[PDB]
Design a protein around this ligand. Sequence first.
Ligand code: Y01
Ligand code: Y01
Ligand code: Y01
Ligand code: Y01
Ligand code: ZN
Lengths: 93, 520, 135, 80
Amino acid sequence: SIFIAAFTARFLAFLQATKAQQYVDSYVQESDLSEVTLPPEIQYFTYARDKWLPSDPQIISEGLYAIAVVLSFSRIAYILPANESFGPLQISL
Amino acid sequence: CMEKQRHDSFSHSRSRINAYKGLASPAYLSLSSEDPVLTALELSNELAKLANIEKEFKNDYRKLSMQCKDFVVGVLDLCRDSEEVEAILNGDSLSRVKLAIKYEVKKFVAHPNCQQQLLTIWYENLSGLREQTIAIKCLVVLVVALGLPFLAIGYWIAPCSRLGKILRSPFMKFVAHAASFIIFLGLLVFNASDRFEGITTLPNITVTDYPKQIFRVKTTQFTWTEMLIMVWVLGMMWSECKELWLEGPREYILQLWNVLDFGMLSIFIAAFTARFLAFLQATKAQQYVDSYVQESDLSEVTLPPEIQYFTYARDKWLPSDPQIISEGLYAIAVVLSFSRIAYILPANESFGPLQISLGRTVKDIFKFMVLFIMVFFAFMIGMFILYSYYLGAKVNAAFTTVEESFKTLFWSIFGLSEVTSVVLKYDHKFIENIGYVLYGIYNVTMVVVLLNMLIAMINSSYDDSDVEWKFARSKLWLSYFDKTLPPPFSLVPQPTRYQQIMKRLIKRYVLKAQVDKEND
Amino acid sequence: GRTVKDIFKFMVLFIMVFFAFMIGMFILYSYYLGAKVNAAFTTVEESFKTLFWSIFGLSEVTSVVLKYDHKFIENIGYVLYGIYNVTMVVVLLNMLIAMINSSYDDSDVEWKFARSKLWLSYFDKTLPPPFSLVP
Amino acid sequence: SLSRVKLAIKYEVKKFVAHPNCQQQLLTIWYENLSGLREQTIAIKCLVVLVVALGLPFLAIGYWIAPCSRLGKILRSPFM
Ligand SMILES: CC(C)CCC[C@@H](C)[C@H]1CC[C@H]2[C@@H]3CC=C4C[C@@H](OC(=O)CCC(=O)O)CC[C@]4(C)[C@H]3CC[C@]12C
Ligand SMILES: CC(C)CCC[C@@H](C)[C@H]1CC[C@H]2[C@@H]3CC=C4C[C@@H](OC(=O)CCC(=O)O)CC[C@]4(C)[C@H]3CC[C@]12C
Ligand SMILES: CC(C)CCC[C@@H](C)[C@H]1CC[C@H]2[C@@H]3CC=C4C[C@@H](OC(=O)CCC(=O)O)CC[C@]4(C)[C@H]3CC[C@]12C
Ligand SMILES: CC(C)CCC[C@@H](C)[C@H]1CC[C@H]2[C@@H]3CC=C4C[C@@H](OC(=O)CCC(=O)O)CC[C@]4(C)[C@H]3CC[C@]12C
Ligand SMILES: [Zn+2]
């Protein structure tokens, strides 16, 4: 479920990003985006890592993804009891 | 066997176990064949191998192997003359003792009747030194360490002399090897003298004896004690390669301690090879300077850069300079060379059992360290994936890379890493709080795994602790019974009488068993 | 008292391992006296000092890092320091286990024997040391 | 089918299931259709794990054609 949550948050961030990209490509015409001044709700998606809103969906995605990776490494418990030397150690643990 | 295996394989295995339980019986062992002690030893080895192979009836085969070992020890116990002890310890040289050491029969070798014979072989040609205190024997070690060159040259004339017999005794062989290793450690230490209180000149400064010479020639030249270390390592490597050629690579690699010894000697060889390459480059630069340029002092001259590089001080030095590799490998080799005390400690009465217990705990520590590695890699990858994007953002570059993440997570085991590792300069609280939580979970998990390791070792801890040490010491003795000079100086170039004794012993065993059975 | 009598042997083993690693780290870092950020392993005194205080976690991990851009020596310092810490932990655990095993009304009779020795020492020393000078 | 073994696992009867007479049967069911691989060392079995990890896409597509093949039986064994 935490993997699902991380990927859902990443997908929401991607949807917002591609909506901003669609707005930029649709309404404004120029050579480089940097010279242009954009509406702020759309311009926010041009900001770097530091500016990013604390509750950005991609921050949630990164955090949940790290937790999910740490937990996914725990699945070795389904595999260890088959071994002759690591089984009893897992039982005692 | 294939036909019996096709149908009722379980019954086939059960029949094999029944046949072996019949063969491993003391009754059939004693009354079956001539020389039943060898039969029982061989059957013990066979049953141990089949216990390792089957792995379902492992306990049955181990019980039968213990039966065979107990029969051998019981037959040995009944000896009440020196002739019978000698007859059991070697068949019609200590043959049965070697064969019981090979088959791991610990109570046969740690039995007083066997230990007394091994002790009279050990302290041969020097009877008085058996009863001296530990202080006097250690003092003898020191005396041999101080006088070993002289005794080395005297051993050439020794075979006629009585002192040659005194030196040829196994105890003096062991004392000579121990004093030799002591001299080796003393050389390793004394080579690092004149730096005990610190280097005198800063690494920025270059000091040379005469102006024309290159500074690297001064830095990489072989001092006398270093050449002595080189010939020493060559001698040890010769001995080890000789035993490798004899026993063969397959059997040689099996013992892990022999692999450690080979690696230590190889690392010494690597350090000296790198030092020699640096010295060759330095002397080539010196030869260029002396050949092509003419001046009073080298400092005033401007040289080609490839040759001039060898005039640089410590700081300028290329990161992959061969002498840096030499220093690193030499430090590792010294640290590993100090570990050779394991070849010497089992002879002692007070330090032997401690070494045995330490070895056992290490054998369990390996498995618990494997679990440590699994958990540690889990958390390392988690923290790296979390904090890698914030390289410039973090106040302390702790989890920004996989190297730094491994570093800080390892040093967190010993509490030597700060808690300010996870805090961010940026105003993101979700990532920083998840870092807090993951770091805390990691610390708690490491503590739990350590506690589980300690408990498992305590439970696995339980006169077997005495017989294991006596077995290790007896292996140490037999290694010297039949290696005369230390590595540095080893470079220079009517049934039968036995059938009567065995019949008497087996009669005693059968009678004792029948009396013990009827009495109960 | 019994635990101390075993602690002596395990401290002898401690001393062997500690001297091994002390000489190793000294031979490694002695050439970098001005180079190291912290003069930890530059001399045998400082090396003994930092390796002893590492047992109690009171010595920093910035001991082994260099100011100079040599990574081989600094990484070997990292590895040797980590191996030393792990080895000290293993020897401590082995000491604890050996003492636990050696721990087993004998504990009562040993104390009563010690107390009876204390008593017989006073059965037949009348005045304390300060006032036992007067004759 | 191992009915009593399943029912003893459900009722937590540990010595019935850990008995050699039961373990031998569970082992002959476990290493089914591959008899030789029972005695190989741990290194070789772990190497088999690595081989399967490298070749799993191909064996996945081959399992569709496998039920007729003998390799399908090799793959259908519980150990594989
Ligand atoms: C059995 C399976 C289907 C369980 C899967 C559960 C998820 C479908 C739910 C449970 C928790 C939910 C998440 C809780 C936290 C967030 C934070 C949220 O971040 C914001 O939208 C705030 C910023 C903004 O205004 O956009 C994004 C949705 C997300 C991932 C939610 C998406 C839907 C999630 C992943
Ligand atoms: C590279 C390391 C330090 C990071 C952690 C790796 C582990 C997350 C994984 C990678 C490979 C896995 C191993 C792959 C091989 C096996 C097979 C399996 O053991 C057996 O084959 C049992 C033998 C039998 O079947 O009778 C389970 C343990 C083990 C070691 C696995 C344990 C978990 C391991 C070590
Ligand atoms: C059984 C015995 C013979 C084993 C001995 C092995 C050595 C002969 C081999 C194994 C590893 C080798 C070493 C691996 C690392 C290096 C680094 C290398 O450094 C460089 O040359 C890089 C800088 C430069 O360009 O010169 C010097 C050679 C050396 C010591 C190699 C020399 C030959 C070594 C010591
Ligand atoms: C100065 C110290 C703190 C640094 C480490 C020294 C050790 C690396 C070496 C130096 C002298 C060695 C000792 C020299 C004397 C012996 C002889 C030997 O013990 C016996 O003689 C056994 C008695 C017997 O033969 O029955 C092995 C242990 C011991 C203490 C050696 C153990 C290893 C020692 C202590
Ligand atoms: Zn046959």
